[PDB]
Amino acid sequence: MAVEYLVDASALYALAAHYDKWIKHREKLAILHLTIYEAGNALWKEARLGRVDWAAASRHLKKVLSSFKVLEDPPLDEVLRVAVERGLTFYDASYAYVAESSGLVLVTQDRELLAKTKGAIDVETLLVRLAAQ
Amino acid sequence: GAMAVEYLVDASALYALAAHYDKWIKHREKLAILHLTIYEAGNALWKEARLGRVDWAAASRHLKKVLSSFKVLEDPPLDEVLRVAVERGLTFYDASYAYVAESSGLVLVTQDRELLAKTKGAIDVETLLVRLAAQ
Amino acid sequence: MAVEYLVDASALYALAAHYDKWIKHREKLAILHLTIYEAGNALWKEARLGRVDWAAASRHLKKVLSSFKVLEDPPLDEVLRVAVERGLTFYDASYAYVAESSGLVLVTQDRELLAKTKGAIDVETLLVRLAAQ
Amino acid sequence: AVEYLVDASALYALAAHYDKWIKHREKLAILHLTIYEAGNALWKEARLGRVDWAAASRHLKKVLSSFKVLEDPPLDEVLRVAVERGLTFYDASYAYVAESSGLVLVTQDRELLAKTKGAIDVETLLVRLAAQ
Numbered sequence: 001m002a003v004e005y006l007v008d009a010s011a012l013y014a015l016a017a018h019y020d021k022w023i024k025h026r027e028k029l030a031i032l033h034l035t036i037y038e039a040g041n042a043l044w045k046e047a048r049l050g051r052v053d054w055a056a057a058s059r060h061l062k063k064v065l066s067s068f069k070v071l072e073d074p075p076l077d078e079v080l081r082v083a084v085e086r087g088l089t090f091y092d093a094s095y096a097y098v099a100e101s102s103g104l105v106l107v108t109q110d111r112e113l114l115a116k117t118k119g120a121i122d123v124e125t126l127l128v129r130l131a132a133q
Numbered sequence: 134g135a136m137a138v139e140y141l142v143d144a145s146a147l148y149a150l151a152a153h154y155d156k157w158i159k160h161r162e163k164l165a166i167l168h169l170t171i172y173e174a175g176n177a178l179w180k181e182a183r184l185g186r187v188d189w190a191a192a193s194r195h196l197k198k199v200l201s202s203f204k205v206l207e208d209p210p211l212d213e214v215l216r217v218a219v220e221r222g223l224t225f226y227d228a229s230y231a232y233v234a235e236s237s238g239l240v241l242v243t244q245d246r247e248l249l250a251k252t253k254g255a256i257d258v259e260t261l262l263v264r265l266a267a268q
Numbered sequence: 269m270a271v272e273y274l275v276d277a278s279a280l281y282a283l284a285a286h287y288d289k290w291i292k293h294r295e296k297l298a299i300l301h302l303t304i305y306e307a308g309n310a311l312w313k314e315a316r317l318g319r320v321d322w323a324a325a326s327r328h329l330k331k332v333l334s335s336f337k338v339l340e341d342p343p344l345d346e347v348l349r350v351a352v353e354r355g356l357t358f359y360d361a362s363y364a365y366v367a368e369s370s371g372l373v374l375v376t377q378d379r380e381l382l383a384k385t386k387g388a389i390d391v392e393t394l395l396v397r398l399a400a401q
Numbered sequence: 402a403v404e405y406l407v408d409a410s411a412l413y414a415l416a417a418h419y420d421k422w423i424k425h426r427e428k429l430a431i432l433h434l435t436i437y438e439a440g441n442a443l444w445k446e447a448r449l450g451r452v453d454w455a456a457a458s459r460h461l462k463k464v465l466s467s468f469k470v471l472e473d474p475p476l477d478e479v480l481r482v483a484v485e486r487g488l489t490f491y492d493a494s495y496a497y498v499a500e501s502s503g504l505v506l507v508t509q510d511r512e513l514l515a516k517t518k519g520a521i522d523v524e525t526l527l528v529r530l531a532a533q
């Protein structure tokens with residue numbers, strides 16, 4: 001119990017393939033309402049370019065996302081400031097803001113975020129940390 | 134959640150409405166947005182700031198208040214939306230709106246012509262304003 | 269003209285892994301100027317997401333793009349008309365207009381563009397055709 | 402000759418200040434990309450209700466045609482500029498050409514103004530032409 005990591009869309013995407021390795025740790029994981037849509041839009045672009053099992057895959061992504069705790073939305077107010085100050089998009093900035101102000105570890109697969117978010121790690125790093133418990 | 138909601142407002146509409154507070158404020162219980170709406174409105178203001186909007190900060194505070202006035206619905210099932218996306222040739226983001234409006238029997242208010250076309254019962258901000266003026 | 273096919277970003281991106289299969293038919297393969305940027309952006313997103321071999325891969329992509337002939341830019345007002353009438357992005361509409369306008373076969377991996385561009389085909393269909401020659 | 406490389410956000414604003422720069426056109430160039438980005442912005446406005454999109458598309462055609470068009474950069478290079486300076490491949494494309502070509506990047510994008518040596522905005526470009 002008690003959230004420790006905030007997972008963004010590219011991290012969630014990577015994680016969907018290691019279900020077993022982390023579900024037992026699902027209590028330490030969270031996302032934003034935003035992630036659901038971003039994961040969806042990414043699955044959508046794949047179906048647009050030919051992914052055949054998009055439907056089945058769509059069900060599995062749904063199951064993966066259901067495993068996570070969902071945090072409250074950050075104030076648009078603050079996020080914009082962080083986006084303007086760090087050269088991030090409003091989307092990425094939302095994760096950086098919530099992670100730092102909430103004292104959480106931001107798991108992302110983006111190189112820009114890892115570098116502009118204090119304490120940010122990648123999916124792999126998250127895995128070693130979880131396996132060590 | 135609530136139930137006095139008749140309209141689902143999207144980012145493009147919300148943005149237009151932001152400059153017509155008075156005409157709809159007293160009807161607020163009738164309008165709703167999705168969580169996604171918060172980020173989309175933000176991303177739009179963000180782009181203006183990136184392009185040199187002087188008052189982005191002040192404007193962000195205003196946009197914030199405007200958003201606080203709306204009821205926020207629950208997130209839709211991912212798979213359903215993806216299907217609507219694929220079927221009507223919409224982005225997953227825009228399909229989230231079409232699905233929720235039609236699934237809940239709500240009127241989608243959008244400024245996007247494509248959405249108006251593929252979402253049954255959808256109206257634009259102007260149409261929304263007239264309907265409110267008469268009630 | 270000897271050119272028969274207009275290849276877009278999604279087509280071009282896949283084609284890059286079947287170099288030998290089309291390189292001999294190259295003089296029948298063309299792209300738009302936009303194609304360069306779109307392809308570079310796709311690789312960029314991959315690097316932003318942790319693609320280690322992005323330095324070397326960008327070189328392979330350059331070579332790939334160099335094998336294609338580059339068509340002249342379409343009229344903005346025409347491309348917009350198509351984008352608005354068929355519900356396509358301006359970028360996508362470009363390919364639709366040029367291909368149909370020039371009597372070429374649009375090769376796209378985008379279901380949306382296939383369904384909306386008269387004669388459009390996918391990469392697989394392109395290969396089988398070149399195979400018959 | 403060419404002195405300034407104008408991107409999409411800049412090209413778009415300048416389209417309202419035609420008389421202020423035509424006579425200076427030969428000093429103005431874009432990328433092939435600039436055509437697609439401009440058209441995509443008008444498309445968004447048309448999608449969002451703009452009524453005079455057809456007419457507006459013609460004026461944009463004329464404006465865009467008044468600019469020389471540089472050769473496409475080595476996808477090779479550009480990518481590097483973008484990874485290092487945290488830009489997108491599109492923006493980086495402009496930072497590369499202007500620099501590697503000793504041109505002054507003209508952009509309405511704060512992020513680019515700051516990551517491209519000697520880059521200036523629309524207003525800045527307009528005061529200069531006023532002088533010359």
Ligand SMILES: [Cl-]
Pocket residue numbers: 087088089487488489
């Ligand atoms: Cl960025």
Ligand SMILES: [Cl-]
Pocket residue numbers: 222223224355356357
């Ligand atoms: Cl679309």
